[PDB]
Symmetry: T
Subunit: 167 residues, 12 copies
């Protein structure tokens, strides 16, 4: 949106915003896949519930990706065109499943959530009072990432508590 | 409903019925909150399932409250106007969460269900063959309280059984 | 959410935020019940409409409570565990029905609303630019409380206006 | 249902039950029409709400009629085949609109309701513990008639209360 | 609708129109009940289908009644306030079930449909080009009565044809 | 639709029809806004119901506009392209809210309705037996305008009747 | 539900109630299958309608089974674990299709309905005023069995009447 | 519908009406297929939109066919029993696709719409004020044919305008 | 689909496949109309049910036609562009209604079903293991034609069985 | 479907196919009940999830039974008319619940799944390329039985993995 | 909302806010009509798509109008009561269709979107941190205006690109 | 599914099948992203339609990935756990957008479709008659890839045909 960008360029560094958004975009796709494949391999304590959350969270990150990519286009930017570039652009590094047990996978995904939380706070901070539209997108995604963290932490807490309780 | 009450006053003590209903109403609001907050804090074995039941049961007690309150109005009564009075009127005492583990919360809520079962049997007994409408309301709620008890007991049974099984 | 709270503790007093949220939570449950019982007893001018709003508003405060409680949990807090504590924590005092006429009940609920608006403006102000997520929750609830106020005021206005109109 | 009736004839006077049901059926159709035409002509205080209830109640009596008629067939009876007979069979007399104001129409329908409540209490009492199926039908209808009474009384109460309130 | 009626009074005899509509209304209620009770007692050939049509047709006549009554009100008329008057006002006489077999009931209802068809043609003729709104209502109902006739005739045709075929 | 218009030009003055439709279109947009803003400001007797009708009627006039505009396009016409022209083209004059009480607003909208009824009767008369499609559109809109009139009159009747009833 | 049963044991013989429920349960499964397979093989007069009812009734008995089994569990009982036992426990004997014509199948299913009607009247009688919850279940099922009887009898009546009519 | 036809025979030539309806019916089936196969082969400018309209219009003509055929039956007529006869009865001649480009197909279908428009105006004229029911059917179909014409003309207009614009 | 066809041309005679599909297409349109007009004129035993099936089957053949036509396009073929050609291409000959009784119409439609069955067995045989996609289409349609045959045969069986039973 | 069967009798032994289908049918009813009663009594580790699967799988086997029975009818066969015969015909023996813990019940149902898997592989092999319709039914059911096996194995895997993890 | 406004008057100039909102309201109604009539007359390149967007955007501006008007009322203001005043109050001038081609109409509407974007940024800036509720409304509308701009620009881009590509 | 795999290992090389599936899985994710980002950047002729297809096809490939991954798990395999490996495993190479015009993007996606087509023909061939379940998955995906190819080719055909037509 050329006229909108023209107006926004007066208030903040749009070019930098686009770079941050493409880093975010790369991170969303990685977090998406990480959950998706995690769902496919998770085993053990509370598996059906944890698998279910991973599936749900995969779908939520995918939607995040779309919100971000659509906004990049509105800012006259180009979203990352090649998945090979995700790894360069991402600050949050892809955390591949090795151990398939639920605690291991829950811990990996919690770290990625923390890094997601850090990204959208930055973008919200960067755009607050300047790019109202991008700011609200970041805040929306942020709220969901905090919920994701909480959801995963609850399972970790429950499994830890079960373990104690059984001794 | 003045004409209805006129007819019913010939068959039973409506004034006493209203008092019983207001004690029941008080109890429903307490049971409602108890489940609601219990859902918010429950941790441990089978948490997602137990939390889910607490949420569902919270909503079911709320609906019980409406059935009772609406009927009080039809009996030309006034429902309890102030939550401060719930504690005076209730026979079932509010059972505050202290321990957040699922067995603790399950046991507390099972106690409340037993108390609710006693209430609606009384009201059903009091109204059977006399106030058909209020009787059917009591029986309806009763059936749901018995199901609630069963639901909670099943988790207690499952967690006890897991514990054995793991040794 | 431990990592989220860790980050937020650098920007604001989360402990204080939780206390404000638990006061808000207490207030929501009281406002909820107030509307719910009000709906059950309201009589007089425009009763069906006013009763309807009370029922709708009861459900809306009920949802506010959930938004607040869920967020308390995310801030590593514990929501108020006992209704007996609502009265201590609440700044907005429960306003029990005495008169059952619609103007009386409307006026009571308008006060409760104005007090709610003040609560969420405070929380919004406290969290603005710092806890984006909690701030948006407060702003969301706030927007609804302002609508509730407007809804109730409209009935007061209409009834007052009818009264005038009928003398002539 | 021949085998079901055979069994029930050992427990109660089914022939009498059928007669009571056909009197009830007649009454439902009259109550149905009364509400339906009442809705069409009602004017004055709280008209839109009162008209709405009349329309809703018309539909609810209509459904009562079906419950009753279906059960008559199950008891090997024949439902009243001619509307001309409704008036003979009905204990509740059709209460034709004369005054179209809402209080007048509300009062007429409240009488019809009270008469309906009496009918279903009788049928419930007659069948209690004996014809479980018919009893539950009567109790179901009864619960609705009590609600109808309450709904109508509320408007009477509100209008009376408005009237007072406006003098001052 | 006072202003609408004022305009229409210049084009046709509204008072007469209202009388015709009230005769139609009376007839709809009778036809409604006739189908309703017919459905309750029908037996024999193609009973489930014939019963089903009677039920459907009952509901369709009921809706006709509402269309007519609502329009009477808009013409500043009063719809018939007492069912006792239906029999006076109706041209189509109520045709009570005596024989419960489907051919008997089908023939009775076909007669009623013929009578209904005559009514709405009259009203359509009376209002054509003058009271556009009432005319379209009459035509709408007419189309449905013609369909009702067809529906009933088809069963008569099918049962007659079965009879032949089986000899 | 060129071929359709070609055929219709043999039966009636299509150019004149289009002008009538554009006057109607202008009137719909004015009636639409009138109801829409009326809904926003109405106060007093039966306000919630009256406001509700205004909102519903606003949406119904909005749909009338679309039916008319679409048909203009089918008649190879151009709908009015500038709201500034509505006022010139409209026979029904925009009736701005001054008094916000429900009787005042009801009376204003009843006039607008009566004027709408006249418009569609004209168009129906103009097209009857000649432009079947446009005629049915006018008749459809007409039937709705008559209902709108009735709806509004009912409230006037009810409020007048309440007023009487309350003196005694 | 242990607390509920404790309360009920004071009012009636729960053990006996459970045995009656398991006999009922066995009967429901047999009635279910009987309708299900009857639907699959029915031929002749009004076949499509009769087949349709059999299909519907099969589904209704299956739901009855669930209501009964769920309540058995709530009464601290164990539902019949093995279909081989159905035949021992059932009073209503499975009535296998031999003749596939609709009258034959209708008669068989009517007899099973009669026996179903007898069962739930007994259970209703046994539990009336004592086990409100189980009583309402029995009454609910009873109402449906009476409807089933009526539905089947109507076809028998129609076919008989067709037969006459065609001579 | 025998009684309805009896009444209508007094007002117009029903036999002739039926012949006109069967010509219309034949035309609808041809127009239906023409659109259907046109959709399957269309190529070029605005293809996806034009294909979509052809698909939609095919479905609309099919519904027209049903309205007409159902009414023929109500008029005691027999609808054309054999597709071989469509070509004899149709005034609108089937216009087979030769050129598959959108302008060619749009022009062919516009001509068929014009001929459809002519048919229903005739039938409306023939039945106006006499057979209210058949008249309303013709008018309903007519309105849709005029819309079809408009829809197709719009594409022709757009493509012509694009062509200019690009030079 | 040019690349797909290129691959398929190595495995089978695509040109012949297209011809078989166009013959099938022609046959579907004829079977479609046959059922559609049959529904409009059927009379007699079990008419409502038989009419209903004809209506349902009409719709099912019409969907078959779409599956076949779409696939022809994917095989780079052209579907039959003119209904006049249906009769040349079809092996299954159009079986026009003469007698309107249900047995006559049922018998005619059964023959056409058998003919459809032969067609899709052929096409399934022709494409099995070679054109997986077209094979699955043919098998899908085949399964529905077998069901159609069964549906129709059931009515013939029922009517024959009624006839006996009534003597 | 007589004509379809006539054609199929040339390609395979239909009589044998019917016997295999009736054995499968018997097996589906047993597997259906097994899951259904298993759901009612299951206790312990992951109970809510395991109970849920048993309920879902009960419903899926019940649908399998319908697919098989319907096809038997189409092959001019008669489905097993008496549940007493299920035990004779079934290869998969009914595996009655003894121990109510989830591992025990999971193991029992896994064995029955394997047995269902064998059955549909056989029937698919028997009919492949010959009875396309029955083959696709067998393959459809097969795919679901493989999924069932996977579902159940997952829980066994999770519970085994929890056990380890807790020591 | 008197108490709300009382509070807000301490934080900002509400009177000025209301004037800005009424200017915005005026502008929304003009933008609404502009799109609405534009949709009615648009011709040429990508017409169906562009027409569709105009229709969608018309509906979106209408909704904007309601959000604004409702908020004016809550701020104890009066929304503009007469459309004649829209032109005085609006900063964005109504841009009447002259040329009906899609590029012309797209350019006109893009201008209007730019003007709308300026308005809601102003209102957002004016209310940020002070009137949270009105601010969020402005931001919400802003986000949609930026999307509208993007949507329109994409068509301009596509049509320009087509033009090049075709030479 | 251990028992299922045991049976399948007798009929084919499951280990090889898993490798082929993981290559397919990798390919689906790449084709998914390719379409997704292509939708985001496409410009020019028929953009809205082409963009829409890319969006739809993105979603369809994403579902393909799930079908394949789920089946890998059932074959006791592990799906590719890291997106970095997609590029190694994929035969179909990721075809990054360079030119954003619709013809360029359409051509790129057509090539990838052909490559998907080859893959599922291979897997269908590999598993035909041996792994019925995996074969049907491959055939299902295959049918969709053929449709995708057709969809894309249609646009190329239309745009080429427009170009000619405009000169
Ligand atoms: Fe994310
Ligand atoms: Fe996340
Ligand atoms: Fe409760
Ligand atoms: Fe409870
Ligand atoms: Fe609140
Ligand atoms: Fe509030
Ligand atoms: Fe009643
Ligand atoms: Fe009543
Ligand atoms: Fe009628
Ligand atoms: Fe009729
Ligand atoms: Fe209008
Ligand atoms: Fe109007
Ligand atoms: Fe049963
Ligand atoms: Fe039964
Ligand atoms: Fe047509
Ligand atoms: Fe057409
Ligand atoms: Fe077919
Ligand atoms: Fe077929
Ligand atoms: Fe199975
Ligand atoms: Fe299985
Ligand atoms: Fe806007
Ligand atoms: Fe905009
Ligand atoms: Fe794919
Ligand atoms: Fe693809
Ligand atoms: Mg989650
Ligand atoms: Mg529960
Ligand atoms: Mg409200
Ligand atoms: Mg009511
Ligand atoms: Mg009918
Ligand atoms: Mg209205
Ligand atoms: Mg039944
Ligand atoms: Mg169209
Ligand atoms: Mg069929
Ligand atoms: Mg499963
Ligand atoms: Mg848009
Ligand atoms: Mg596609």
């Amino acid at each position: 949106a050329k006229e909108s960008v023209k107006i926004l360029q007066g208030k903040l560094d749009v070019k930098s915003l686009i770079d941050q958004l493409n880093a975010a975009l790369s991170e969303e796709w990685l977090a998406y896949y990480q959950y998706w494949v995690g769902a496919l391999v998770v085993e053990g304590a509370m598996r059906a519930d944890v698998q279910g959350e991973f599936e749900e969270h995969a779908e939520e990150e995918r939607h995040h990706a779309q919100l971000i990519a659509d906004r990049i286009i509105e800012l006259e930017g180009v979203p990352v065109l090649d998945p090979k570039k995700w790894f360069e652009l991402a600050r949050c590094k892809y955390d591949s499943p090795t151990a398939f047990d639920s605690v291991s996978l829950l811990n990996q995904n919690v770290s990625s959530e923390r890094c997601a939380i850090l990204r959208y706070q930055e973008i919200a901070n960067f755009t607050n009072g300047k790019d109202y539209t991008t700011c609200d997108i970041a805040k929306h995604i942020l709220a969901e990432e905090e919920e994701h963290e909480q959801d995963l932490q609850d399972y970790l807490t429950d499994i830890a508590r079960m373990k104690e309780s059984f001794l």
